[PDB]
Design a protein around this ligand. Structure first.
Ligand SMILES: [Zn+2]
Ligand SMILES: [Zn+2]
Ligand SMILES: [Zn+2]
Lengths: 65, 48, 1098
DNA sequence: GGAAGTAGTTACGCCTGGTC
DNA sequence: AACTACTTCC
RNA sequence: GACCAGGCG
């Protein structure tokens, strides 16, 4: 849905890094280099950013009022 | 009894009484479906 | 040559142009475009009992989806409103009537004959051809593929039925009487006829007709069908000398007894027993014209063609007798045609239209007789309009769709659509079922056939009774829609085929069969087949046409029917495939589409018959001059849930089946529309994730936009014996951070029902003076209107819609709606609306947060099911030298017995994907090899085996062995322990048997069956058996008259006990027995049986 | 002795929903 | 359906 | 209450 605030495994905060990672990867930079620059060294943290889906945009359209 | 109701297609509020009004419809877009709105009261939620 | 990675582009284009539900949409669009008018053309004009009046039928027209308000008019209706207000998403159906007054036709009148339910996303629905934003504005998920119906607010999907090919004769051996049996299922206007011929052990030929109670000698039927001459019969059946002799022997004993004119009478004796000779003749000719080979026709002119077809069937059974041909396989897909939504709707509409036609005839006759001819001919339009009564057809169709019981013996045709997630819905929309009974051991029908390759998924099938009988389509499968047969017949005849009337079949002449019926004869049948396929590739012949030949028996089969499962292949000619690199580039750049490639003759569609003639290669480097086709993508032979599994060829087949079946039960964002959707139950994983090791097919289909599951860090070690026996150990810190979190939705419904006489019920908070009043605490959250405020915490047995009904006790009774006794949550949404009839309707949705706990079921894509055996704090979990803590631990003892190497390869691939920052391709046969993954893991700085040095959290020292750890995509299934736990101390009982009710929803009791009774007996526990089966179910006391043995009567008014049968008052004593046994005594005293009871002193 | 007919069975729970 | 076992006409 | 369908071991 929306990017998790913390890594499920070790609790490192990765909420802010997702949008930077997405824009840098779309810019054409190497994903490994981007993830290293962001500070995610453990592959548990890299799993959180690499496998996340922004589903909030696709469901914001329907309101419950 | 006048009750606050919210339309389905449009989000703007509609006022009527179910017991009296035989026909329920938003008198602006003709929508038969309405939402009972959330009361403006505090709700305590445990963050766990 | 072309890389398989380049054929992937073409396959992706195939899935892009045509969705995953194209079979339903194609069949239903064909039904609407031509099927309805075809049915109405079968149903000739209504002729009533009027002197000079009858009505012809014009053109069927279906309008836009609209709903007639009870007090308003036909407003436009959209699917969301249809599925929220509990309506049926249907459209008006209009039929023109042509009145024929004394042989002349007046101006037409358009009358509505009923409503026809509309399948979503079809060419008549309001969602057709709408952009994503337009569908979103209508409160719909643009990812939804349609292909289903909405009937009374519920989504119904019609599952295709794997029937036997119609009008095709199959030969097989009885193996009991040494009788060769050849049967055909002739279809005409929705009616099937099982015409079979039989060569018994005596060498005589017998024919079976469904409505003829006894078999009849074949020559008798042949002569009854207009074949006067014996030599003509012998020539027509066959020209081979051995067959000629067999027919001569079979015909001498027939001609010596029954001639041409005698055969009809002989059949009439069995069909219509009695002395009425004219009635016997009428019944015999009726069962000949209608009940024997109906597909040939019902007119006497079609009798002769029936004779030719019967002769061909006899020739086939004789050839089987001589062993010149093998037995016909019934599981071979050349012999099975699917029945889709279009044809099933056609049959159902035919039945409903027959009902409507008969009803209108009755109404017309009655109204004419009961008001003469004053206005029937003065104004015929009103006479027709008032006699319509259109509700019959719509009620019949809607009832059939809602219950699923089709006309005839078919049941379960329409099933409730599964909306657990994306995979479940799409797989349900791509499902195939067999009509065979699930109880019987259909060993030949429950096994995988070689013809299933590319047509049916080899691994996705349910466990248990339905195994093998319920099948799902392969991703490359395409199901045909029929083309007009007459044009195909004319083209084939123009190709050089001469009809059998002019030229008779000969051993050196090819027998050509179109659509399973023999049409003519040609020489050099291979040339005809080559010309046919060359014409099809050139584009002048439609795609649906398929042709095959058989050198063994010199037969050319041409198929143009509907319901054939086909697969696409690349045409290979002279060792060079037709597809080239420039075609792939054009497809990639969007200049070329899949239909274009099919039209140019680059890619071909083959069913089982044509594939029999093929020699298919599997890889481009395997192509030789002898190959006829090349496989577009061998990984597309799997189903969709089966394609979810990564590295499926490194797993055992049972585990692949388990994983494919469990992929349809996972939790995730199945549809973005869930918030405003009203559904009985639903789930929502709070943080779905893309599988790090995933197939490219999953991205092409769209599973990535609706993922269901998460990537876990999995360590394979034994930990405190709490993951023993397929149990799973999980991390508490991971759960508390959102791992596998989910929310459960339930939607309760309350309707303000309007009873007869104006006695309505009311939405209100009931006063305590009403009967059946619950506690005043249960109405705590209710509003004065009578509805619970949203976002108000609701626990078990709290009411949501306070409701009171008119009294019917022998004050107003209470019928309010409360949550189920074992369910809690928060009121997410309360909507109010109006029903179809006009009564008020309210839907209340309650959401319950389900944090994982002990007992919740988790599964991986490789079939490793398990429940949480323990929830361990993070400080107790082991950790790796790289700082990696598992989110989940699995016992190694579950790996080797199951032989799921694919799970280990997926763990390696997931670790490599996380380290690289690029997801790993795990496609079925072109995915990244395990050797490459191990080498890459080695180069990334980790051990190539995937084992890592781990430390014990409890004691702090490193484990002796290097622990295998990786990233595996685990999914949480909807089998939560909160939805299954049940306990009943004491509660309601059934009225009939006084035993506890059945079901978790109604405080039911657990059935202590007879198997448990034998278990208790084998232990010697006699008093425990008494306590479990007598005290705790239905213990009662009865009065028995010792003199007679009947049951004595106790008069509570007179305070006396006596036996009415004999009038005894002193020899009466109590006995103790289960109420079920007293009921049994009652049912035995019924049907006149006397169960006299003898009593003993204890 | 056939040679057909006829009848009698075909695991145990459990859960969900939907329609009568 | 697919097995058995009778039954029962032959 | 009994019918159907889908699952679970
Ligand atoms: Zn981490
Ligand atoms: Zn409105
Ligand atoms: Zn007595």
């Amino acid at each position: 849905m929306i990017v998790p605030v913390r890594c499920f495994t070790c609790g490192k905060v990765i909420g802010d890094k997702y949008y930077e990672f997405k824009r840098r990867v779309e810019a054409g930079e190497d994903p490994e280099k981007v993830l290293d620059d962001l500070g995610l060294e453990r592959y548990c943290c890299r799993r959180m950013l690499l496998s996340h889906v922004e589903l909030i945009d696709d469901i914001m359209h329907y309101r419950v009022y | 009894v006048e009750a606050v109701y919210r339309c389905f297609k449009c989000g703007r509020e509609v006022k009527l009484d179910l017991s009296i009004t035989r026909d329920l419809r938003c008198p602006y877009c003709g929508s038969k479906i309405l939402y009972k709105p959330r009361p403006k009261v505090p709700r305590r939620v445990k963050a766990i | 040559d072309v890389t398989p990675d380049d054929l992937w582009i073409v396959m992706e284009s195939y899935w892009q142009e045509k969705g995953l539900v194209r079979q339903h949409l194609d069949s239903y669009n064909a039904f609407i475009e031509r099927g309805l008018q075809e049915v109405v053309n079968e149903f000739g004009g209504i002729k009533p009992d009027i002197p000079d009046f009858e009505v012809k039928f014009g053109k069927i027209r279906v309008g836009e989806p609209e709903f007639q308000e009870p007090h308003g008019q036909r407003k436009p209706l959209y699917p969301m409103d249809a599925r929220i207000r509990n309506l049926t998403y249907a459209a008006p159906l209009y039929l023109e009537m042509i009145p024929v007054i004394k042989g002349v036709e007046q101006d037409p009148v358009e009358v509505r004959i009923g409503e026809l339910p509309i399948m979503l996303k079809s060419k008549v629905c309001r969602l057709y051809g709408l952009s994503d934003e337009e569908l979103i504005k209508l409160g719909e998920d643009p990812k939804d593929p349609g292909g289903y119906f909405i009937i009374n607010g519920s989504e119904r999907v019609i599952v295709s039925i794997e029937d036997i090919a119609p009008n095709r004769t199959l030969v097989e051996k009885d193996e009991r009487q040494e009788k060769y049996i050849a049967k055909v299922f002739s279809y005409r206007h929705g009616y099937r006829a099982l015409v079979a011929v039989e060569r018994r052990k005596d060498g005589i030929l017998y024919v079976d007709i469904p409505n003829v109670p006894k078999p009849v000698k074949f020559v008798y039927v042949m002569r009854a069908l207009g074949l006067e001459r014996d030599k003509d019969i012998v020539e027509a059946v066959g020209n081979d000398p051995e067959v000629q002799q067999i027919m001569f022997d079979n015909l001498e004993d027939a001609s010596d007894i029954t001639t041409q004119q005698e055969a009809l009478e002989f059949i009439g004796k069995l069909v219509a027993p009695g002395q009425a000779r004219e009635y016997r003749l009428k019944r015999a000719e009726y069962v000949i014209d209608n009940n024997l080979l109906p597909h040939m026709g019902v007119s006497p002119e079609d009798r002769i063609k029936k004779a030719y077809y019967l002769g061909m069937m006899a020739l086939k059974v004789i050839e089987l007798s001589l062993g010149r041909r093998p037995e016909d396989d019934k599981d071979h897909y050349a012999n099975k045609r699917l029945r889709l939504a279009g044809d099933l709707l056609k049959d159902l509409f035919r039945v409903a239209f027959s009902q409507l036609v008969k009803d209108i005839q009755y109404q017309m006759t009655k109204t004419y007789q009961r008001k003469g001819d004053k206005y029937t001919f003065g104004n015929i339009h009103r006479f027709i309009r008032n006699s319509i009564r259109p509700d019959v057809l719509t009620e019949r169709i809607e009832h059939a769709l809602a219950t699923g019981a089709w006309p005839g013996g078919r049941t379960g045709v329409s099933q409730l659509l599964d909306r657990t997630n994306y995979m479940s819905t799409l797989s349900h929309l791509r499902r195939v079922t067999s009509p065979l009974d699930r109880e019987q051991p259909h060993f030949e029908a429950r096994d995988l056939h070689g013809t299933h390759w590319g047509r049916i998924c080899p691994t996705e099938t349910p466990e248990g009774p339905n195994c093998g009988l319920v099948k799902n389509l392969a991703l490359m499968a395409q199901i045909t829609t029929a083309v007009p047969e007459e044009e195909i017949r004319e083209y084939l005849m123009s190709l050089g085929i001469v009809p059998i009337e002019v030229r008779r079949p000969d051993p050196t002449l090819w027998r050509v069969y179109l659509n399973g019926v023999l049409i003519g004869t040609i020489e050099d049948g291979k040339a005809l087949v080559q010309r046919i396929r060359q014409d099809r590739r050139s584009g002048k012949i439609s795609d649906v046409i398929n042709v095959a030949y058989y050198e063994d028996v010199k037969e050319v089969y041409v198929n143009s029917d509907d319901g054939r499962v086909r697969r696409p292949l690349i045409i290979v000619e002279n060792g060079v495939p037709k597809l080239t690199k420039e075609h792939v580039q054009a497809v990639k750049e969007g200049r070329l589409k899949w239909s274009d490639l099919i039209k140019m003759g680059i890619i071909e569609y083959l069913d089982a018959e044509e594939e029999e003639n093929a020699y298919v290669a599997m890889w481009p480097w395997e192509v030789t001059e002898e190959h006829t086709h090349l496989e577009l993508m061998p990984a597309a032979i799997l189903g969709l849930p089966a394609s979810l599994v990564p590295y499926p060829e490194h797993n055992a087949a049972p585990r692949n089946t388990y994983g494919a079946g469990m992929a349809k039960q996972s939790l995730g964002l199945g549809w973005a529309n869930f918030r405003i959707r009203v559904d009985t139950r639903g789930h929502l994983l709070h943080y779905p994730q893309i599988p790090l090791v995933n197939s490219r097919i999953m991205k092409a289909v769209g599973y990535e936009d609706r993922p269901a599951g998460q990537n876990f860090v999995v360590a394979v070690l034994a930990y405190q014996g709490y993951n023993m026996e397929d149990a799973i150990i999980i991390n508490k810190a991971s759960i508390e951070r959102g791992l596998a979190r989910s929310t459960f939705f339930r939607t309760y419904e309350a309707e303000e029902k309007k009873y007869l006489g104006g006695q309505t019920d009311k939405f209100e908070i009931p006063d305590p003076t009403v009967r059946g009043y619950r506690g005043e605490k249960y109405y705590r959250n209710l509003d004065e209107d009578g509805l619970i405020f949203p976002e108000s915490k609701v626990e078990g047995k709290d009411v949501l819609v306070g409701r009171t009904s008119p009294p019917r006790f022998l004050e107003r009774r209470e019928t309010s709606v409360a949550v189920r006794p074992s369910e809690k949550g928060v009121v997410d949404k309360v909507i109010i609306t109006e029903t179809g009839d006009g009564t008020k309707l309210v839907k209340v949705t309650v959401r319950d947060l389900r944090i994982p706990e002990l007992g919740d079921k988790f599964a991986s894509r490789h079939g490793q099911k398990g429940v949480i055996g323990l929830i361990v704090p993070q400080e107790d979990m082991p950790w790796t030298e790289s700082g990696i803590v598992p989110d989940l631990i699995v016992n190694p003892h579950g790996i080797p017995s199951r032989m799921t190497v694919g799970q280990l390869i997926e763990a390696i691939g997931g670790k490599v994907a996380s380290l690289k920052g690029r997801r790993v391709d795990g496609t079925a046969f072109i995915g990244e090899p395990e050797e490459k993954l191990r080498k890459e893991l080695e180069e990334l700085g980790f051990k190539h085996t995937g084992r890592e040095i781990m430390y014990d959290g409890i004691t702090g020292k490193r484990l002796e062995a290097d622990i295998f750890i990786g990233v595996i995509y685990y999914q949480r299934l909807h089998h939560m322990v909160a939805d299954k736990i049940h306990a009943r101390s004491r509660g309601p009982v059934q009225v009939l048997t006084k035993q506890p009710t059945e079901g978790r929803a109604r405080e039911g009791g657990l059935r202590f069956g007879e198997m448990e009774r034998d278990v208790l007996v084998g232990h010697g526990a006699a008093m425990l058996l008494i306590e479990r089966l007598l005290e705790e179910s239905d213990k009662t006391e009865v009065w028995v008259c010792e003199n007679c043995g009947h049951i004595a009567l106790e008069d509570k008014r007179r305070r006396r006990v006596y036996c009415p049968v004999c009038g005894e008052e002193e020899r009466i004593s109590k006995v103790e027995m289960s109420y079920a046994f007293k009921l049994l005594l009652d049912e035995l005293k019924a049907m006149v049986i006397r169960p006299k009871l003898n009593l003993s002193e204890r």
